[PDB]
Design an enzyme around this catalytic site. Sequence first.
Site, PDB file in Angstrom:
ATOM      1  N   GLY A  65       0.804  -1.218   0.000  1.00 56.51           N
ATOM      2  CA  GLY A  65       0.000   0.000   0.000  1.00 56.51           C
ATOM      3  C   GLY A  65       0.833   1.262   0.000  1.00 56.51           C
ATOM      4  CB  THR A  66      -0.116   4.853  -0.577  1.00 56.53           C
ATOM      5  OG1 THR A  66      -0.895   5.378   0.506  1.00 56.53           O
ATOM      6  CG2 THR A  66      -1.052   4.384  -1.713  1.00 56.53           C
ATOM      7  CB  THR A  67       4.242   5.881   2.561  1.00 58.39           C
ATOM      8  OG1 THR A  67       4.973   5.144   1.570  1.00 58.39           O
ATOM      9  CG2 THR A  67       5.047   5.912   3.866  1.00 58.39           C
ATOM     10  CD  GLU A 118       3.255   7.219  -1.431  1.00 59.35           C
ATOM     11  OE1 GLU A 118       4.124   7.549  -2.265  1.00 59.35           O
ATOM     12  OE2 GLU A 118       3.346   6.183  -0.736  1.00 59.35           O
ATOM     13  CB  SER A 139      -0.396   1.483   4.721  1.00 58.66           C
ATOM     14  OG  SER A 139       0.184   2.760   4.924  1.00 58.66           O
TER      15      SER A 139
END
Lengths: 111, 243, 195, 235, 231, 244, 250, 240, 241
Positions: free
Chosen positions: B29-31, B46, B74
């Site tokens: 996943g995104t941060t 993010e 995330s």
Amino acid sequence: QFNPYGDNGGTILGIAGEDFAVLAGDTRNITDYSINSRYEPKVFDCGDNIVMSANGFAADGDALVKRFKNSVKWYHFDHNDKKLSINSAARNIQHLLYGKRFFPYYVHTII
Amino acid sequence: TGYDLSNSVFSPDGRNFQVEYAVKAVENGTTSIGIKCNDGVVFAVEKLITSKLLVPQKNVKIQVVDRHIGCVYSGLIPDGRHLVNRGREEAASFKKLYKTPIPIPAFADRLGQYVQAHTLYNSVRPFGVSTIFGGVDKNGAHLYMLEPSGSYWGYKGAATGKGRQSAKAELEKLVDHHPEGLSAREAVKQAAKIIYLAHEDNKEKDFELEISWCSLSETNGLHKFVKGDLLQEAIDFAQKEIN
Amino acid sequence: MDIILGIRVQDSVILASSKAVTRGISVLKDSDDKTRQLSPHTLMSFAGEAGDTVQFAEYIQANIQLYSIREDYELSPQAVSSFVRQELAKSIRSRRPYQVNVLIGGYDKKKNKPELYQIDYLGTKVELPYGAHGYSGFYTFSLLDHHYRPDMTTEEGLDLLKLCVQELEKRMPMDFKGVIVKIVDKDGIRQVDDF
Amino acid sequence: DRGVSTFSPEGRLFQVEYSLEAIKLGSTAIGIATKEGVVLGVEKRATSPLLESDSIEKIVEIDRHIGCAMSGLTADARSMIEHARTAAVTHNLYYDEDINVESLTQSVCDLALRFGELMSRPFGVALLIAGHDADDGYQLFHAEPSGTFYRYNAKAIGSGSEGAQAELLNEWHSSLTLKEAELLVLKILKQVMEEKLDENNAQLSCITKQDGFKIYDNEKTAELIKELKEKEAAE
Amino acid sequence: NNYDGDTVTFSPTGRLFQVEYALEAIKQGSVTVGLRSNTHAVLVALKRNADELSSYQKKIIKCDEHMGLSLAGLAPDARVLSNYLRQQCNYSSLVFNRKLAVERAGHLLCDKAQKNTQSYGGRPYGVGLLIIGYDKSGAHLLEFQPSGNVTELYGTAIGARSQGAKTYLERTLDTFIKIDGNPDELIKAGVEAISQSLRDESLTVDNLSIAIVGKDTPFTIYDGEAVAKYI
Amino acid sequence: GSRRYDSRTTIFSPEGRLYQVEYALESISHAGTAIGIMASDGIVLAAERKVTSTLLEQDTSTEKLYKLNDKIAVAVAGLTADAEILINTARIHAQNYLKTYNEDIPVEILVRRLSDIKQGYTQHGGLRPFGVSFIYAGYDDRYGYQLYTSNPSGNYTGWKAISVGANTSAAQTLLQMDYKDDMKVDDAIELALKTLSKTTDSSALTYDRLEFATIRKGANDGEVYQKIFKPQEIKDILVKTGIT
Amino acid sequence: MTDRYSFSLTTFSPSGKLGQIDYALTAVKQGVTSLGIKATNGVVIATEKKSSSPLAMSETLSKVSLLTPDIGAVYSGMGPDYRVLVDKSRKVAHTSYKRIYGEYPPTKLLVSEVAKIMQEATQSGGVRPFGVSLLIAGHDEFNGFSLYQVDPSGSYFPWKATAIGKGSVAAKTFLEKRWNDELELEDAIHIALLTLKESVEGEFNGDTIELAIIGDENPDLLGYTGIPTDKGPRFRKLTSQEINDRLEAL
Amino acid sequence: GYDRALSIFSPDGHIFQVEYALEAVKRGTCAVGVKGKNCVVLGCERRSTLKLQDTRITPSKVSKIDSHVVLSFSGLNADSRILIEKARVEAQSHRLTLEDPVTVEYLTRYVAGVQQRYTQSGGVRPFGVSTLIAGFDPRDDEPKLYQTEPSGIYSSWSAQTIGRNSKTVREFLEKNYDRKEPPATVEECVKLTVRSLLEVVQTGAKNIEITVVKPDSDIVALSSEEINQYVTQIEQEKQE
Amino acid sequence: GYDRHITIFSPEGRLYQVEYAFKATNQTNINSLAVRGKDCTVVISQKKVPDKLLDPTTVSYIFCISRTIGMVVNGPIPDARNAALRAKAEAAEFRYKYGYDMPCDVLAKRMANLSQIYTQRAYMRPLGVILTFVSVDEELGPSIYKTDPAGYYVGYKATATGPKQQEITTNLENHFKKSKIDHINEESWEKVVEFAITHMIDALGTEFSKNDLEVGVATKDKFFTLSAENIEERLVAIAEQ
């Protein structure tokens, strides 16, 4: 002991013409000997060219009109935007009212 | 094997592989990060831009629980939301019985036990999210991070997602070079930097920054989103450091 | 509805049951058979609250007929009565109880002997030589105490019943529009087609 | 085994797709829609000469303005007919009016995906629902166990359908008359049936706004078989 | 592989294959496009027939006077989900006397779809939806995906070949975003966008479906002769 | 999901047999043989105990012959624990019929309900069947003396004489041979023991490996007596018939 | 969504075995040896207290349990299963007997109750059989003294004497030699202590042995006086000391 | 409760548990029924792998549902008891609410539906039973014979057989039954029924059972003695 | 191989799922130890904080269950907290129903019976934990009762748990062989804690700073844990040998 019913007075009136019809009602809302409002309308447009008044105990009256208006909405959704015939409205209202047969809506209804 | 095809089965090592597989979804996943400051907490994440067709600002990912708690996660977004809805039910029913809004450690274990509950049976799947959350309560500020296993601890700072390591290292720096404390607004800037620094790994597309914070002095103990000016001021502070 | 009687003679049971059905101020019908046949050699007469009486009789009838079919066998009148008693005793602590009184007269083919059972809506059963429900007893139980003997022929039983109906026609305030009389014996049920 | 409600990697429901296979094994059913009426016909397919052919009920009334033909596991359709009849009669009770053919169909179609770990498996039968209402006139609908229904000018289902449908593609035009359609249904059935079409191993029916839904007598179809055979001698 | 038996199972990479196969049903579905300016939002959907004698499967469903969606994938699932949505709009109306936020419809849909991806015995919804509405903060377009991921956009497309229309809008962004107070222009752009996802057939009268909602426009559907105007 | 671990106990083989019923029947074929023989004036039950040790409390014991009511008793072949579940069920059913009709339960009716229970476990519910076969020995005033058997499938049938458990192939042919309809009870008693003597999978047929019961007309006329033999009495009848 | 395991986990294999019952018996075979002996005026049950650490206090772990004032149980196999069984068995002695008839259940009947619970884990949805074999020793006014054995199948049998677990095969043979139908209780205690010594590896004294009797009534153990008819429990655990006293004359 | 879908579709569009139920019927002792001109006769094989049966009390193979309708079956015996009981109950229920005994078609349709229900419900396997349901509608002299099978499909038959070696005797009846000319007498119909069973049955012995239903609830079972006389009779017309 | 996934018997009469839950027990790589004073019961566990980002105060495996009962857990934290919350609930409910404080051994039994069920009923997995309960019971004096995934429980003179348990067990075993008493014969809990930390050092052959340990003390009517400083003070007194 809690009385679930009240009585908000008023009076309504419907006459049918050759190619028209009227539904009239005074705009006074009362409890016992007080006036609550001098303009609180009780005759409503429910779409599909049908007008409705449920006169008696306003809370029960409003509940009903509100439910039938919703009946109109779902009739459109469920049967491809068909128009609700005045007689089909009347029948649908019978079922609305008789649904509370053992805890009634204290209203005399006219459409 | 077969030990990994059913949730809640112990492998002979002593592991539940399906929790571990859920971790992989988180890592994909995104941060997102949490920074605990002097009298509050700051959350940032993010938000990758798949297209110039995403309306900027209008796909909010940080969520609020009660009035005073912020959560970000995330991994599988739907799962994160489902867990937050539960946190909202937990926090409402705590407040209903005890009148005081739910303390942050108390709240952490409510999410804790509920996530752990999904490692107990084969008929549910574990949560596909690590969650960073916290806020201000009657005892000061608290930051928490919570894994698919149901494990959670308190944190000085914390991070998860693709950029987990660089962010982590960047947070470790902060703890050393500000041992006495980091202020609310300082931590807002710092968070903006660290999201940028950890955009190294999802370098592919570009992103939208999103921050929120909960400071006793700055937001009065309530969770608010960082918008307009103070937001852009911290975007700028982070443009300056990727230079 | 109103009056139901029964008397067991030498080797038959005779049930007499009033023919009138009254709603408030009007006698709605004067040819009502307050009776259901439960099996070839068992008859049940009933009286009590309206609706309830027939609903109960018909329900009991259905239950007994189902048993007959399943086992290819007619139940004894003792057993049928014991079933019916339990059905009533069960209903007495019901939400809405059955308000029905019955007489069960049957001929036990296995012991060649007629039997009469009197059971009130509470599930109170008794075997009697003669029985009645409600107000009928008060007038007839004194006639029957006197004129009844255990070895009467079937016409002796009917003549004795004639007295019973006559006394009720003299002294009952209600006009019950006569009786339908039915005999239960070794060859089944039949109805005396005038009184 | 694996789930009853699972997806193939293609993105389709296994259990639906396999039900579709069972319908292909079904006896043939054909419907054609005309401005004068809709006609439903079916291959009866008595499995042995001894079975009394008119005890085969594969065309069935729903209301006076809606009829139904079936193909596939026909015992599965019993409860679909029940639901359809009740929905129709119910709506008449709530609204003092006939229920629209599309609405009836959509109701039956709701049932169909209500299965899984409600019933244990999808239905093994397809339905041709054909009727008339004041707003949309004469209609013919194809109701699958997938939940989807399509409206057809003409449609064939069952084992004969792949061919039959292609035949209906050439022959249907927007100005067909009722007699023409009756014959046309008889023609195409005869063409796809194993055994030789007569008034005993096939059955006809129609729905008109005037007389409603009628199943035809064996004597009446017999004469349309005669009339068809005679017509095809010509040219 | 072994891990596609059901939704309750994670693959060792951390993927849910049952959800991905559900995502696949969408891509076999016929294309549909959404796009909005600041005053209107438009759905354009390419309808599909079964053969030459069949009807053209309707793909746009009305939810309230101010909201509606188009579908691509399993139509019954779209019917279930549209129905759920209608109820939420109706509950916001009835209890709160408040037309329901398009953004909330988003979250409510996301959450409903997520239930079916974490419990045993269920199955993901096999349909993608595009939601347009005019609410208290203007025109809106939403892309629902049965994984649970709901997304607000200026425009998008889903279904088979949708990738053409999606790159088209990605270019045309600053043009259509400013088609304020013109309904027919905003529709035009949607009809042009859907054309980039065609092959072998292009838009006839009873295969094209258009919907519009906005500032002084109730969500209304256009089919047949009423869309001839745009062919 | 949980399905992975589900045997599916209520399914058909591709030949149309119920796997679980079959294997339960196979289980019962290793149980001590039980024999029922019916005479014109009584019924006999005899059963062999599973190879008893010398320390087992022989007299105050039951594992094969159980009392259902005053008029009906059963002989068990299969799992003792399974049988007792079914027995208490049956004993209640007996008592209900009495309370309802004020008449003792006809033998077949009791057998039918017990068999109907067994049947249920083979069609629905996903649980294993009861690994039990019964010989029912009873009297009623409609069919006089009656013998029945029921197996895990929930099928029951009536018999003049019958065996269940081990070696019923052998035991059934021996019975078919020396049985006659006019036969009286004391002969049936003797036939029963002679039959176990030939089919027993151990050498001696001593009293301590037997349970035995008779239902005779024997009493004060019209009434029926049910006799579960004490061990001393099994020894006496075993010497008397000259098997020891 | 809670218990979705509503199907049997014990089923018949093609050969006619019920595997899980067989395996539960295997688990019992591994368990430490326990035994019971019927005397004429008493019954004794005994087993070895075999501790996991010497840091454990094993008077706390109690393998011989009172079920009613006249009934005791001992076991072999898995202790936790035994523990919950003693719990269910004590409650059932009340709920389905004492609360109805005002007296405690007779031995065979209570044993029947236990067997029923044990049987049900053989058939009910989503459970394994119990992993124990129990020996229940009891007295009741109309049956005298008795001793039963209950297996994972839920089948039970009465015994003059028997043993179960590890060294049962040997110990059943030892008992077969020494048992007669005239044993006074003290003799059966003595025999039980000898039979148990064969099967014991380590120390053999009052701290490594748990041994109980169903003997005479103990008014000293009742807790109150003044009802002449209530006479006190017949069940009694012997002390560490009382055992050691008899290892003198061993 | 036990949920599992035991009857499901296979890739070839077959429901195997239903089809394996038909296999259990295949194995069942043979059963036949024949429509006369004013009667219906139900014939039934009884496998002869065992004598020593008390046949007073062993369940007989033709069952009275009401006093004017009977039902025989081939397949699992325990399964058939359930269908019969259910049918008998519905039969009395129909008399209670409609004030008329069931029609043979109605009752058949009911039983057929119960069988169908078990093919798409969780936790249940189908009925390993097919039935012949025969009788006379109330105040109707025209005879009825129907058949159900585990799938739930049902239909009417001039004559029909089910169970083991039914394929053999359906052949015989197809050859030996004029629809234009049903067996006029009761005797005639009964003879045709025994003849078809003797293609498959072994000895006439305690192997055959016949039951005869005439209108107005006129049902009688034939005794070994009288059936013997049909066996003997056709035997001596084998002299061609 | 399915008799290895759920809690049903293997052919040799074993429950592999229970055994594998025992293996998860050590996955935290922490050793715990408990001893009895005259007045007190002390429990010590190793505190290992690898990450600099963690808030060290939130990292703990000792729980205050009631006023009088302490519990230390050997195993993964989510299962530990699960067991803690439950035992807290059970302890409070017992007080409400029966009008006195739940005893250590009773609570241990109750938690053991719950664990037992997970070994018999299929849909519930065992918890990968071992629970060491401690109190000074009003009836029994100082008490240590321990619970595993098998559903086994028993009282101890003293005990240890974890990867290096056996060395600790034998270290203590030897002290009591020599001392010849049931307990640490000491006036104050302060010195019993000191004893515990000492014999832990000796057995594991390692040294502890104030943040490598975690200590819970149970006394007459309260159970409490020590802070960095109360420990540091205690480590410092140990420095005087």
